[PDB]
């Protein structure tokens, strides 16, 4: 549920979407999703399309995203726990 709370945060914060995008390729994001999200001009808008492409309540996809965040920058997880 942490994720949903930073579903809002990260859409306005993270700037490394293209790398996280990897963590979901085929796992959760097919090429139709992938290209669409990549085509967006801003990192905020890239995340906006991305999170509308993961409407699954499945914890797996959320957990994969978190692991991606942990392996990408490793900072936002503490910064959003506050």
């Amino acid at each position: 549920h942490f994720i949903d709370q930073h579903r809002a945060a990260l859409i306005a914060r993270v700037t490394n979407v293209e790398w996280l995008l990897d963590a979901l390729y085929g796992k959760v994001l097919t090429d139709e999703q992938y290209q669409a999200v990549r085509a967006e001009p801003t990192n905020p808008s890239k995340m906006r399309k991305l999170f509308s492409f993961t409407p699954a309540g499945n914890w797996t996809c959320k957990d994969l995203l978190l692991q991606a965040l942990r392996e990408s920058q490793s900072y936002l997880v503490e910064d959003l726990e506050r």
């Binding site: 993270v14 700037t15 490394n16 990192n43 900072y75 936002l76 910064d79």
Partner: protein, 85 residues
Amino acid sequence: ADKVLKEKRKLFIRSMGEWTINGLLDELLQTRVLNKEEMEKVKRENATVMDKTRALIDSVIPKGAQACQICITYICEEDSYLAGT
């Protein structure tokens, strides 16, 4: 403190060079803020100094309290005409 740092800091990061930028990237990488690849992306950005700075500043966007602080403290050991108090 934290929110004040960044708006005032785009404000003053326009007064700088490449000696500074080069060193900045080394510490921001080693302080685990971002990967080799983003450091590579900023270095291979088709600009010289200026847009590369706005790029580092796009790394302070997700930045938390300590993430701004590591940058500002790195600024501290030089002539901070940036007015870093």
